[PDB]
Enzyme design. Sequence first.
Site, mmCIF file in Angstrom:
data_model
loop_
_atom_site.group_PDB
_atom_site.id
_atom_site.type_symbol
_atom_site.label_atom_id
_atom_site.label_comp_id
_atom_site.label_asym_id
_atom_site.label_seq_id
_atom_site.Cartn_x
_atom_site.Cartn_y
_atom_site.Cartn_z
ATOM 1 N N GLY A 1 -3.337 25.718 3.556
ATOM 2 C CA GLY A 1 -2.254 24.985 4.223
ATOM 3 C C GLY A 1 -2.697 23.661 4.851
ATOM 4 O O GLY A 1 -1.900 22.732 5.021
ATOM 5 N N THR B 1 1.567 27.835 -0.792
ATOM 6 C CA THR B 1 1.702 26.685 -1.719
ATOM 7 C C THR B 1 2.679 26.967 -2.864
ATOM 8 O O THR B 1 3.041 26.043 -3.592
ATOM 9 C CB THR B 1 0.309 26.202 -2.295
ATOM 10 N N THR C 1 -3.926 16.580 -7.931
ATOM 11 C CA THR C 1 -5.155 17.386 -7.731
ATOM 12 C C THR C 1 -5.232 18.164 -6.432
ATOM 13 O O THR C 1 -6.164 18.956 -6.242
ATOM 14 C CB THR C 1 -6.426 16.498 -7.789
ATOM 15 N N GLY C 2 -4.258 17.988 -5.527
ATOM 16 C CA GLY C 2 -4.310 18.650 -4.213
ATOM 17 C C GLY C 2 -3.883 20.124 -4.276
ATOM 18 O O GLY C 2 -3.459 20.606 -5.316
ATOM 19 N N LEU C 3 -3.967 20.820 -3.169
ATOM 20 C CA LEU C 3 -3.679 22.289 -3.154
ATOM 21 C C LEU C 3 -2.238 22.625 -3.488
ATOM 22 O O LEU C 3 -1.934 23.736 -3.950
ATOM 23 C CB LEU C 3 -4.078 22.874 -1.808
ATOM 24 N N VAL C 4 -1.348 21.674 -3.228
ATOM 25 C CA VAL C 4 0.057 21.845 -3.635
ATOM 26 C C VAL C 4 0.218 21.389 -5.092
ATOM 27 O O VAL C 4 0.901 22.090 -5.893
ATOM 28 C CB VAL C 4 1.041 21.088 -2.712
ATOM 29 N N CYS D 1 5.517 25.246 5.424
ATOM 30 C CA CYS D 1 5.386 26.633 4.926
ATOM 31 C C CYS D 1 5.502 27.654 6.040
ATOM 32 O O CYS D 1 6.183 28.698 5.912
ATOM 33 C CB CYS D 1 4.060 26.856 4.158
ATOM 34 N N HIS E 1 0.314 32.976 4.321
ATOM 35 C CA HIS E 1 0.503 32.871 5.761
ATOM 36 C C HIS E 1 1.182 34.170 6.219
ATOM 37 O O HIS E 1 2.274 34.560 5.768
ATOM 38 C CB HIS E 1 1.397 31.635 6.086
HETATM 39 N N1 LIG Z 1 -0.852 23.096 1.458
HETATM 40 C C1 LIG Z 1 0.210 23.755 1.964
HETATM 41 O O1 LIG Z 1 0.254 24.987 2.239
HETATM 42 C C2 LIG Z 1 1.337 22.963 2.187
HETATM 43 C C3 LIG Z 1 2.588 23.575 2.178
HETATM 44 C C4 LIG Z 1 3.769 22.812 2.294
HETATM 45 C C5 LIG Z 1 3.665 21.452 2.266
HETATM 46 N N2 LIG Z 1 2.404 20.852 2.333
HETATM 47 C C6 LIG Z 1 2.380 19.381 2.372
HETATM 48 O O2 LIG Z 1 2.124 18.730 1.096
HETATM 49 C C7 LIG Z 1 1.250 17.590 1.308
HETATM 50 C C8 LIG Z 1 -0.079 17.667 0.541
HETATM 51 O O3 LIG Z 1 -0.746 18.870 0.954
HETATM 52 P P1 LIG Z 1 -2.104 19.486 0.277
HETATM 53 O O4 LIG Z 1 -2.428 20.743 1.103
HETATM 54 O O5 LIG Z 1 -1.786 19.595 -1.223
HETATM 55 O O6 LIG Z 1 -3.098 18.201 0.582
HETATM 56 P P2 LIG Z 1 -4.572 17.914 -0.101
HETATM 57 O O7 LIG Z 1 -5.057 19.150 -0.823
HETATM 58 O O8 LIG Z 1 -5.405 17.263 1.012
HETATM 59 O O9 LIG Z 1 -4.132 16.819 -1.241
HETATM 60 C C9 LIG Z 1 -4.098 15.397 -1.133
HETATM 61 C C10 LIG Z 1 -3.631 14.896 -2.511
HETATM 62 O O10 LIG Z 1 -2.800 13.736 -2.381
HETATM 63 C C11 LIG Z 1 -3.380 12.595 -3.075
HETATM 64 N N3 LIG Z 1 -3.208 11.403 -2.197
HETATM 65 C C12 LIG Z 1 -3.690 11.258 -0.932
HETATM 66 N N4 LIG Z 1 -3.290 10.054 -0.447
HETATM 67 C C13 LIG Z 1 -2.544 9.463 -1.413
HETATM 68 C C14 LIG Z 1 -1.880 8.255 -1.475
HETATM 69 N N5 LIG Z 1 -1.953 7.434 -0.406
HETATM 70 N N6 LIG Z 1 -1.187 7.911 -2.596
HETATM 71 C C15 LIG Z 1 -1.145 8.753 -3.645
HETATM 72 N N7 LIG Z 1 -1.792 9.941 -3.604
HETATM 73 C C16 LIG Z 1 -2.490 10.307 -2.508
HETATM 74 C C17 LIG Z 1 -4.838 12.957 -3.395
HETATM 75 O O11 LIG Z 1 -5.240 12.442 -4.672
HETATM 76 P P3 LIG Z 1 -6.715 11.808 -4.961
HETATM 77 O O12 LIG Z 1 -7.675 12.865 -4.431
HETATM 78 O O13 LIG Z 1 -6.632 11.531 -6.466
HETATM 79 O O14 LIG Z 1 -6.729 10.628 -4.020
HETATM 80 C C18 LIG Z 1 -4.797 14.479 -3.405
HETATM 81 O O15 LIG Z 1 -4.507 14.899 -4.745
HETATM 82 C C19 LIG Z 1 1.011 17.502 2.815
HETATM 83 O O16 LIG Z 1 2.019 16.664 3.370
HETATM 84 C C20 LIG Z 1 1.253 18.910 3.317
HETATM 85 O O17 LIG Z 1 1.632 18.876 4.697
HETATM 86 C C21 LIG Z 1 1.247 21.623 2.394
#
Ligand SMILES: NC(=O)c1ccc[n+]([C@@H]2O[C@H](COP(=O)([O-])OP(=O)(O)OC[C@H]3O[C@@H](n4cnc5c(N)ncnc54)[C@H](OP(=O)(O)O)[C@@H]3O)[C@@H](O)[C@H]2O)c1
EC number: 1.2.1.75
Lengths: 354, 354, 353, 354
Positions: free
Chosen positions: A179, A331, A11-14, A148, A243
């Site tokens: 991000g 993303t 469900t997260g942004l990625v 990213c 970005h």
């Molecule tokens: N966003 C970007 O531009 C970007 C780019 C490259 C890489 N990333 C990396 O990818 C990762 C996630 O980024 P995001 O921006 O998608 O974060 P986000 O939107 O805050 O998403 C968090 C997601 O991870 C799940 N989660 C959190 N803790 C967990 C755990 N302990 N066990 C299992 N699931 C868990 C949550 O699910 P529930 O809500 O169901 O708990 C939620 O779906 C980060 O490490 C980030 O640095 C980000």
Amino acid sequence: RTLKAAILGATGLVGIEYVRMLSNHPYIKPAYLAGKGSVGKPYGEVVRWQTVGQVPKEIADMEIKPTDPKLMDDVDIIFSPLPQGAAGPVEEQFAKEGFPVISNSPDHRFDPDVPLLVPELNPHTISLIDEQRKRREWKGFIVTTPLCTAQGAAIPLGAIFKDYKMDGAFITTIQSLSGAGYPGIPSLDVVDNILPLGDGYDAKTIKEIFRILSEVKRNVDEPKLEDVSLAATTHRIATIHGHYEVLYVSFKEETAAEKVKETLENFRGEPQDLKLPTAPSKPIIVMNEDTRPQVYFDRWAGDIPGMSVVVGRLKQVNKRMIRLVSLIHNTVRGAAGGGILAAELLVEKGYIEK
Amino acid sequence: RTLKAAILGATGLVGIEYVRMLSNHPYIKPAYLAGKGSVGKPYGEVVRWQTVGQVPKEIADMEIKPTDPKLMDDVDIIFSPLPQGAAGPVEEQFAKEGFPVISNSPDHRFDPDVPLLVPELNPHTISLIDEQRKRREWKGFIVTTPLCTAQGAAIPLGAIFKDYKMDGAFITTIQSLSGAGYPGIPSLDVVDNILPLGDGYDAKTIKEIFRILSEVKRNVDEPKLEDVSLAATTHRIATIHGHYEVLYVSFKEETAAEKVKETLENFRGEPQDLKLPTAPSKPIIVMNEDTRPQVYFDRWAGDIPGMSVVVGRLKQVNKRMIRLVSLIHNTVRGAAGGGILAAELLVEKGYIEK
Amino acid sequence: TLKAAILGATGLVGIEYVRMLSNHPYIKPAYLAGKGSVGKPYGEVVRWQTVGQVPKEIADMEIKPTDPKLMDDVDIIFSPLPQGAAGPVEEQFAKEGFPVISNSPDHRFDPDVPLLVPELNPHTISLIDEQRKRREWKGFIVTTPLCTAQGAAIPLGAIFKDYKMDGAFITTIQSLSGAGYPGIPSLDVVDNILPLGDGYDAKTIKEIFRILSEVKRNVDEPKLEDVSLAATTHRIATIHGHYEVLYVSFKEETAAEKVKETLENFRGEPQDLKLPTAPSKPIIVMNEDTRPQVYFDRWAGDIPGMSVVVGRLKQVNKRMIRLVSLIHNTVRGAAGGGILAAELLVEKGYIEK
Amino acid sequence: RTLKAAILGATGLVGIEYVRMLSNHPYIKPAYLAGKGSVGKPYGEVVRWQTVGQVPKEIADMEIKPTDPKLMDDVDIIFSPLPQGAAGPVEEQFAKEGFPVISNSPDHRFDPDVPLLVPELNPHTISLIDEQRKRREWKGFIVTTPLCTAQGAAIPLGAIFKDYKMDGAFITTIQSLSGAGYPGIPSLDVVDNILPLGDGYDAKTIKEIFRILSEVKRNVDEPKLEDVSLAATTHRIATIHGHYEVLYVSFKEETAAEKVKETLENFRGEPQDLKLPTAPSKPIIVMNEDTRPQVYFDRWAGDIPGMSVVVGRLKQVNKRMIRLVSLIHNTVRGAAGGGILAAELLVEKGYIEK
Ligand SMILES: NC(=O)c1ccc[n+]([C@@H]2O[C@H](COP(=O)([O-])OP(=O)(O)OC[C@H]3O[C@@H](n4cnc5c(N)ncnc54)[C@H](OP(=O)(O)O)[C@@H]3O)[C@@H](O)[C@H]2O)c1
Ligand SMILES: NC(=O)c1ccc[n+]([C@@H]2O[C@H](COP(=O)([O-])OP(=O)(O)OC[C@H]3O[C@@H](n4cnc5c(N)ncnc54)[C@H](OP(=O)(O)O)[C@@H]3O)[C@@H](O)[C@H]2O)c1
Ligand SMILES: NC(=O)c1ccc[n+]([C@@H]2O[C@H](COP(=O)([O-])OP(=O)(O)OC[C@H]3O[C@@H](n4cnc5c(N)ncnc54)[C@H](OP(=O)(O)O)[C@@H]3O)[C@@H](O)[C@H]2O)c1
Ligand SMILES: NC(=O)c1ccc[n+]([C@@H]2O[C@H](COP(=O)([O-])OP(=O)(O)OC[C@H]3O[C@@H](n4cnc5c(N)ncnc54)[C@H](OP(=O)(O)O)[C@@H]3O)[C@@H](O)[C@H]2O)c1
């Protein structure tokens, strides 16, 4: 025929980009949507679909399941975009249970036996898996994709460094809110404001760029990477995705902006040659207008939308310095899309069975 | 003893700063508010008071009056923030009628007999007035203030160039909406977007920085300014006031970030020595936190709010390169405030009688 | 297989015609017209302020003059022209024998010109026959209503058909694209809310009244002359999507739950006839107390952007309910409504193959 | 002599307004700045000064001190803008130690012995303190100020209800980010979006409005408050301060908009009669332009900036229905400013000594 993937953090942004892109993928299926806080719920109901279109019809009613290796005998591939600190130990448990893990998280990016992978730049580093499995004594593996922001720079800089005596790049970034995740950046930080990310973030950005550049196979050998000067000043503002980076790039000897431009336009690597399904025809797209690229209009560019870094504004500053700008979809190329491309590369090279 | 000022373009984004600032000035009085479109109506009812506080009580009932010298016998000083093209000829008519004109418009900024004035950097160039009056054969004069974006760079760069062997500055700007005026920038250009201003605007920004630097009296003499490389990449986003710039500054020889930081902290010029009413105590304020300055929090900094350029993020990139950022309030120091300070210098030097 | 001209093709409405007709089963976007931009490749001048990318077979088309004589081969004119310019131009096109589907205000109150919402007043296309005889032209003009009026009138029309509605008191929070480009200055909406003023409030309800006056009702109380409507309209810094809060009063005790089922079940002629651009659910009803939201719901439905999304149905007192509605202002509110009107006009024989 | 106030939550969005206003108050001094997380640190260094001007120079270097009754022998008044849940018991501990506590927290808003006070509307409800001290057996007391959203509606509605047969008000609100505090509302919730607050928030809003209205001394006696229908539909957008509301107001009998407009223009209460320092001259300011009030331009209106509710758009909808809009500064009138005004009233009526 088809590989069954689990998307961690679905469900997260990625996660939503994995869901979106895998729904249309020729052979990798989004078969297992994992979470923590929302386990048990229909995905369509709880997701913030903060991306193009709508939750896929066939995915909306799928149940969010636990993040537990033992419930996943039926899954072939693990995509892991988990928050820092939590990702590290989880990704190891999956590798120890025999899964290939493609991670977007920062935790393992500097492990010397884990690829920090940009498929067009350092595809041979997948070889690291061999030593990894041996020394970690596990049958699965971990590959990571880079920050990213590091990719929006490293892609054009890697293209340049391969053919030119590049001795520095001095970078300013203006990054989007997505991000940081959700809840991520407080609104009061970016309304009528520019939020600097600080020294720690500037440092980790160039640290990742250096590792990626150290792994590029060059056509010239000067200067040595040790003698290249990199610096970044990084910021977030109220854009949703994309970005934007401004790069001033210096060279040890006179270098023509127009030659570097042709190098960028012609850039391709193994993903293109191999014709991987998620490989953009033009991993670097170069725009000629002096007001392009722009975040809103160009962040979904290319034949695989969001997979191409869009460069423009190429200009001679002096005989040994050029200015360019780059825009990456943080993303798609910056996370999930580069992660799927990495999976396709691993499948083609025999690291993941189809 | 006091002076009566006319404020041309009084309802505009620069005009309102003249109104706000002059309402409290110890000796220059906002006596005549000129406009075009709304002549006949009370100021308080037509103005968009896009700045701090409220329209001053003794101003709100003053009527908007025509921009015409023949209506202006009682006025001692003209402040002129008129649009590019309309400004040049009007400013000439005023000078020809005997008025001292302090202009914030671009039209006269490169006339070699017209000062392009930053009172802390090139105060001696007011001397150009003598030749100006002789050769133009007029009794009044024109003095200009530079493009806000060029001041945001030239102030810190001018303080450095004075004392160090600076041989390059490679700049990225993130500017506010108010610099474009009203209606100025369409909302659709900046919601969820970054708008690059283009090659023209990048080129004019460094052209103005060169002219200003060419007039700074240095304490060292290497390199010559002809061999300094300057470049800018300029953009607007959805901030209201405050232009934020990232500067990578190179030197001919090894130069310490901490020494440059002290030079910036200690920077003062003739406006401070003279104690002019609108001269900041610290024309450059240095911040030490790695997330400051921020636009929203630091654009009104200083004992004279909005008159100080705020610098921070001072850091060594390599032996011959440092990184810093600067924030200027684009309609205070960057326009009206700079203009009032110029007038105070002209008055003190006897160019404007009191 | 019909060819359309899209007037104002580079505009915020024109890009939706281009996007939607690019894939239409039988209306081809064959001619892109403009003013300032004439002679330039469409792809090079257009601000693609919408989803995806300029369609490749459209990006390379040359922008042509807005001139009825140069369009031998075209079957349908779509006309999203600026108020004032639109009126006379749309008349020249009808005079030349073209079906003209207009999103401009100029003709919206001509009594012989449909002010058409296909699910609410499809029978008003009948006005065309008298139109053609009295204006003595072979073509015709149909208009679509103000996007803000549609955001209200679609749910209000569904209610008015089945309930004794006697008032609706509306607050709107509208998007920037509604004003076109350059449209709203950035300084009017950063850290601000811009009220649109009495004229805009008045024109919104005037349009709603004409639409409601043409709805075929299943009840006969109160008479429309006794219905009180009011709007307070605003724009903020959203890109697309007009969001409305409606307090709706009724002559007698009326259940929010019943009104909610009427909205969920609402269908009209477009859905009955299975028109390509008719959404399955012209009104989509959401149950969450934080939905709809502009960003997340403005592209909802099997035909994205064509459904009005309603939520927040709640009993205020026995004779008053609260609901909110969200309309995609350039899809349903302009080009997508325009295309659906064209399909209706084809089906009814007013536009011939 | 001055009274020494303690401001709890001194660094918060409400805390900063106490700091700003008390810094210039004739006789209540910001003497003690309390916190939790930032205890020990200089106020100037940790605060986000998200308001007008700069941190007062005499405050910047003051150290944040523990929220503890025992350190506060020197303190005469407690201002309490503490988060819901945590405020309740803390505010009780202060009253038990003999302190006057003026709270902006929701916790005690519906205790029937605690005033829910808008000084212009229900000033007589301070009488509740006497029963409060007896029944609770404490020497101090608690007074609350209402939800800012409720005040934006209840001020104009209460002025109307006092003189007209008002029988309904149907409200839509478009609220600012600062009302949620910090980190408060995620950026991704409001960029290119409108965030509805939900059923709970709509209900608490009208619940508070009813309590306020029930304590207004009226000049007419129809209808009974039990027969008045109130509803709200609440939202936040990306504005920094200022809550904007559209009200449709119904009446039992024919009622003229112009008559109601004059009532609003003429509204005043005890704070004005008593000439309290923080009482605006015009607690309701009425604007005539059909595009006013606007959040940015009118949220600081009035002789006491931010203390007036600004109403506009008065219009007859039908013989028994009018439309108006109101704008309140949510942390000035809506919180700290009303809190300071309450204090002045409580001192003037002799509930707080000197
Ligand atoms: N966003 C970007 O531009 C970007 C780019 C490259 C890489 N990333 C990396 O990818 C990762 C996630 O980024 P995001 O921006 O998608 O974060 P986000 O939107 O805050 O998403 C968090 C997601 O991870 C799940 N989660 C959190 N803790 C967990 C755990 N302990 N066990 C299992 N699931 C868990 C949550 O699910 P529930 O809500 O169901 O708990 C939620 O779906 C980060 O490490 C980030 O640095 C980000
Ligand atoms: N904004 C900045 O950051 C900034 C900084 C440095 C300098 N400047 C310069 O200062 C100037 C004004 O900028 P702004 O940002 O204040 O613009 P703005 O908000 O668009 O205002 C322009 C004003 O000039 C008046 N005006 C326009 N044409 C005129 C004419 N032909 N004769 C007399 N009055 C005329 C208008 O008065 P009526 O509407 O009553 O006709 C209006 O009040 C520009 O040259 C700009 O480049 C701007
Ligand atoms: N935007 C909405 O939400 C919305 C919804 C419902 C209806 N509408 C209505 O649709 C119409 C267009 O709105 P918009 O938002 O698309 O405006 P816009 O983005 O400003 O577009 C104006 C378009 O019309 C063309 N044009 C201007 N003057 C012309 C002329 N004299 N002759 C021929 N073409 C001319 C322009 O072409 P060049 O650039 O080549 O000159 C441009 O493509 C308006 O009547 C509006 O009220 C808008
Ligand atoms: N913002 C408005 O428009 C507005 C208007 C009216 C009423 N209010 C009410 O005022 C209160 C504060 O709102 P805000 O918007 O100012 O929130 P905020 O910006 O998040 O501030 C919270 C403040 O409370 C302190 N704090 C948090 N927990 C504490 C505890 N357990 N003990 C002592 N101090 C604690 C924090 O200080 P440290 O971090 O140093 O510990 C911080 O200074 C809320 O009850 C709110 O409902 C707000």
